[PDB]
Design a protein around this ligand. Structure first.
Ligand SMILES: COc1ccc(C[C@@H]2NC(=O)/C=C/C[C@@H]([C@H](C)[C@H]3O[C@@H]3c3ccccc3)OC(=O)[C@H](CC(C)C)OC(=O)C(C)(C)CNC2=O)cc1Cl
Ligand SMILES: Nc1nc2c(ncn2[C@@H]2O[C@H](COP(=O)(O)OP(=O)(O)OP(=O)(O)O)[C@@H](O)[C@H]2O)c(=O)[nH]1
Ligand SMILES: Nc1nc2c(ncn2[C@@H]2O[C@H](COP(=O)(O)OP(=O)(O)O)[C@@H](O)[C@H]2O)c(=O)[nH]1
Lengths: 430, 438
């Protein structure tokens, strides 16, 4: 029996992970006391990937909540999910990294990485078999980005035969006013290129765009964005949590979706995306869900998939739907829009149907795609990095922690090489 | 957990710091002997004025101050004044021979014979503090002590306290009240020496304070007392974010991050709106929008330069008194509709408003009027390059024929140090122009 070790680093990672574990426990029929209360036996099957079954039917998550400040742990414990998590798995330092990637990757991350590796080894030693690691963090902040990439490197050192999956939240200027978030984002992107096998590029710009235009919110808070990411992250791991045809159990998902070792950045999406308290007025059927699944306005990374080619797609449908109509609509989408898919990867759109929908929606359509359009996101973050780096703003806070100035140029060159590789595999034709 | 050691080098620094500590005791309600009516009921520290006022066992609020001069005149003046028992006699350092308006005397010959005593007093004051952030060095660009000994002290505090950040409150020289002719020489030399050793320097010229006093307080002969009271008001509401509750700029690191992008571009400009005379106290009131406009008025700054010809980088609007935060955003929007304020081409954030509800207190018997709404605008701009260009123009005028250079080479300095400081200030002018060109 395989099992994923979940890690949450930073404020954004902790908040999104708390909302994510709430939605997952609601989908699996688990209350906050760790007792099963659902009416279906399908929810109890393949529960060992995420929930650690303790004695007397106690389902605690295998979440390792990491920060450099205890305020996020106090905020998690202030919610209902505080007693749900393992209290020994909470790790926090004394002071935060303060939006410094060097201070979260070289000093405070170095002093906390031994304790978090001790907790990782404590979770790993009780495994009958380890599947891989799932990390939720943010590329913008200091502790999230820096200690996330340091923990990624340490996990790759200790367990090099295990897959590494990240849910990396790319920062935006439309949601945060901190200026050095391109520095932390580009240095973490340079680490995630070389040290990670699977990355779900969630963009706060795309979440702000969805909450601004689609959800009609004048002032989108962090709650609406975290609700969107919790919905999409519950939909993405519905292949891992439930048995199915396209099981895609982490290594199988990486084998299907990743053709090239650096082009492992996915573009998650969720077709009936609605704000909280308003999802009961959405008409749900198959072809509208498929036509909203591939919409650029609906996709949760700030990219235009019409401007790129889908290298590999993993469309998973959720709810009570006929698989004949779902497969007919997706073959119609693939054939009628054959210019948007690569011709050198035959049958790159994989369809699965899970009969358990997310709560609040009768039918759902959650999409994973290794689209080539994510080079627009990397171009945007690299151009903000170049605008903040060509005249060396705030480099003294990074070079004062022992970071060389060659590391910024190496990160810029690696992300530009990744953009060049994406453009090369877009322009090539079989 | 946060402690600051104010250092007052030179006559200007000592007098400005004495006025500043008078206004700090006035704002915090501290009695001149050291006791406190209200906040000594607890009897403990860390009440956010423990950054500056250390509390002894007797309840005396002795300040974390070091007063340095090479002349015992103003030190005896503060040893004779109304706060003679507030300051410890060990921390008030006098000298025998002055620096005589010479940088090389205060940096190489006269200041080198007293630097270890001042370092010993600094370490003795730092050993009491368990959470020390850094220092606030009060000095002047023009004088001998306030330039040379400040540069020597900045070198010593960088080689000894390298994990700490050092603020500065320098006095830029004015021709209206000038004690010397070689003030451009000392100013350029101490700016070259304290460029790698200062983290955020708030230079204020006496020309702007002179013009503000003459055009607002109606004094056509402003003495050093009126200038001292006004600059004490300016620096007191600069530091009012630091000695009070936490909204913004609560630390020296917050000062270095909110305003200072480069290690060399670290010269913000303060601006104060309600500078009104004590006679015109009940004539009218002042709204938030007009005091924000006067904080964006170029004639109200602490530096005589024009910000509309340069490009901004930051703005930390610091409101004092009973100011409701609703109309501050309307004032921000009316400022933003004026496209004279033009930020840089990066993510510019905006006017970081923080509001302190403690009312501003003026000195009784001073020329400043008691007001209910006060505002400080810390702005980093490229307009300070005009002031440095004026200084380097006077430096080039005096150095074209090598006037007064023998007073500096004769006290241990080299001839090439003048050209090195001129090239460093040319590089600072180039850096300010490169930020100014986009
Ligand atoms: C044109 O230039 C500008 C444009 C906009 C702005 C607005 C200004 N932008 C910045 O300060 C950019 C800072 C770079 C990092 C640097 C890289 C950190 O390693 C430094 C560090 C600091 C403390 C401890 C450890 C490490 O600082 C921060 O993250 C600070 C640290 C806080 C939590 C204390 O936090 C903030 O930023 C605040 C205080 C929450 C908000 N700040 C702003 O809106 C300013 C300028 Cl000068
Ligand atoms: N605002 C203000 N400026 C002052 C005051 N006292 C001196 N200055 C300035 O100090 C500058 C020259 O420095 P000095 O007053 O000579 O003090 P110093 O640095 O110790 O120089 P020496 O006494 O020769 O060692 C002048 O240009 C004045 O503008 C003061 O009380 N208030
Ligand atoms: N989508 C989303 N992004 C967030 C949230 N909270 C913070 N962020 C982003 O994540 C970054 C904060 O990283 P953080 O973990 O706080 O690092 P720290 O500042 O060192 O503690 C910022 O760039 C924000 O843009 C959230 O609730 N939702």
């Amino acid at each position: 029996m395989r099992e994923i070790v979940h890690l949450q680093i930073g404020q954004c990672g902790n908040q999104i992970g708390a909302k994510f574990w709430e939605v997952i426990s609601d989908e699996h029929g688990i209350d906050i006391a760790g007792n099963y209360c659902g009416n279906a036996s399908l929810q109890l099957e393949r529960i060992n990937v995420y929930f650690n079954e303790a004695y007397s039917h106690k389902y605690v998550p295998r979440s390792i909540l990491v920060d450099l400040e205890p305020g996020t742990m106090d905020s998690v414990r202030s919610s209902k999910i505080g007693p749900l998590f393992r209290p020994d798995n909470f790790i926090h330092g004394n002071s935060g990294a303060g939006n410094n990637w060097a201070k979260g990757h070289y000093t405070e991350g170095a002093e906390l990485i031994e304790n978090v590796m001790d907790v990782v080894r404590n979770e790993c030693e009780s495994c009958d078999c380890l599947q891989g690691f799932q990390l939720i963090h943010s590329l913008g902040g200091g502790t999230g980005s820096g200690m996330g990439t340091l923990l990624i490197n340490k996990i790759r050192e200790e367990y090099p035969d295990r897959i590494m999956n990240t849910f990396s939240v790319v920062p935006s200027p439309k949601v945060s006013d901190t200026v050095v978030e391109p520095y932390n984002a580009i240095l973490s992107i340079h680490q995630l290129i070389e040290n990670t096998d699977e990355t779900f590029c969630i963009d706060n710009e795309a979440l702000y765009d969805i909450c601004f235009r689609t959800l009609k919110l004048t002032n989108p808070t962090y709650g609406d964005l975290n609700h969107l990411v919790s919905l999409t992250m519950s939909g993405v791991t519905t292949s891992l949590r439930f048995p199915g045809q396209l099981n895609a159990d982490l290594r199988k998902l990486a084998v299907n979706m990743v053709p090239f070792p650096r082009l492992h950045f996915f573009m998650p999406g969720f077709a009936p995306l609605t704000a909280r308290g308003s999802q009961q007025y959405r008409a749900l059927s198959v072809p509208e869900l498929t036509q909203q699944m591939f919409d650029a306005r609906n996709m949760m990374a700030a990219c235009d998939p019409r401007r790129g080619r889908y290298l590999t797609v993993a469309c998973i449908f959720r709810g009570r739907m006929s698989t004949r109509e779902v497969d007919e609509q997706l073959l119609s989408v693939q054939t009628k829009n054959s210019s948007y898919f690569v011709e050198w990867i035959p049958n790159n759109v994989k369809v699965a149907v899970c009969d358990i929908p997310p709560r609040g929606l009768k039918m759902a359509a959650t999409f994973i795609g290794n689209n080539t359009a994510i080079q627009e996101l990397f171009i945007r973050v690299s151009e903000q990095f170049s605008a903040m780096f060509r005249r060396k703003a705030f480099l003294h806070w990074y070079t004062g922690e022992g970071m060389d100035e060659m590391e910024f140029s190496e990160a810029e060159g690696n992300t530009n090489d990744l953009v060049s590789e994406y453009q090369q595999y877009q322009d090539a034709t079989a | 957990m946060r402690e600051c050691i104010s250092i007052h080098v030179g006559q200007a620094g000592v007098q400005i710091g004495n006025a500043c500590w008078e206004l700090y005791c006035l704002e915090h309600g501290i009695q001149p002997d050291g006791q406190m009516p209200s906040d000594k009921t607890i009897g403990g520290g860390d009440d956010s004025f423990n950054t500056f006022f250390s509390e002894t066992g007797a309840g005396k609020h002795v300040p974390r101050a070091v007063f340095v001069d090479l002349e015992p005149t103003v030190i005896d003046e503060v040893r004779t004044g109304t706060y003679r028992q507030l300051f410890h006699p060990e921390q008030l350092i006098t000298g025998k021979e002055d620096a005589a308006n010479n940088y090389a005397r205060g940096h190489y010959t006269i200041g080198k014979e007293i630097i270890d005593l001042v370092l010993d007093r600094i370490r003795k004051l730092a050993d009491q503090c368990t959470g020390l952030q850094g220092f606030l060095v009060f000095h002047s660009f023009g004088g001998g002590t306030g330039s040379g000994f400040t540069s020597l002290l900045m070198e010593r505090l960088s080689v000894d306290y390298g994990k700490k950040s050092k603020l500065e409150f320098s006095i830029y020289p004015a021709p209206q009240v000038s004690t010397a002719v070689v003030e451009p020489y000392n100013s350029i030399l101490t700016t070259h020496t304290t460029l790698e050793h200062s983290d955020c320097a708030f230079m204020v010229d006496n020309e702007a304070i002179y013009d503000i006093c003459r055009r607002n307080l109606d004094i056509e002969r402003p003495t050093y007392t009126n200038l001292n009271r006004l600059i004490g008001q300016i620096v007191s509401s600069i530091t009012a974010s630091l000695r009070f509750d936490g909204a913004l700029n609560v630390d020296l690191t917050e000062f270095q991050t909110n305003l200072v992008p480069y290690p060399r571009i670290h010269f913000p400009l303060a601006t104060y709106a309600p500078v009104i005379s004590a006679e015109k106290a009940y004539h009218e009131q002042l709204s938030v929008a007009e005091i924000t406009n006067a904080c964006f008025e170029p004639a109200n700054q602490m530096v005589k330069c024009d910000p509309r010809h340069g490009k901004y980088m930051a703005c930390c609007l610091l409101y004092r008194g009973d100011v409701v935060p609703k109309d501050v955003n309307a004032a921000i929007a009316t400022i933003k509709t004026k496209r004279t304020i033009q930020f840089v081409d990066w993510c510019p954030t905006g006017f970081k408003v923080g509001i302190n509800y403690q009312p501003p207190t003026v000195v009784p018997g001073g020329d400043l009027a008691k007001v209910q709404r006060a505002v400080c605008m810390l702005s980093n701009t490229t307009a300070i390059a005009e002031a440095w260009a004026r200084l380097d123009h006077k430096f080039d005028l005096m150095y074209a024929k090598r006037a007064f250079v023998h007073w500096y080479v004769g006290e241990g300095m080299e001839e090439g140090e003048f050209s090195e400081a001129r090239e460093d200030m040319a590089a600072l002018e180039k850096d300010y122009e490169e930020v100014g060109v986009d």
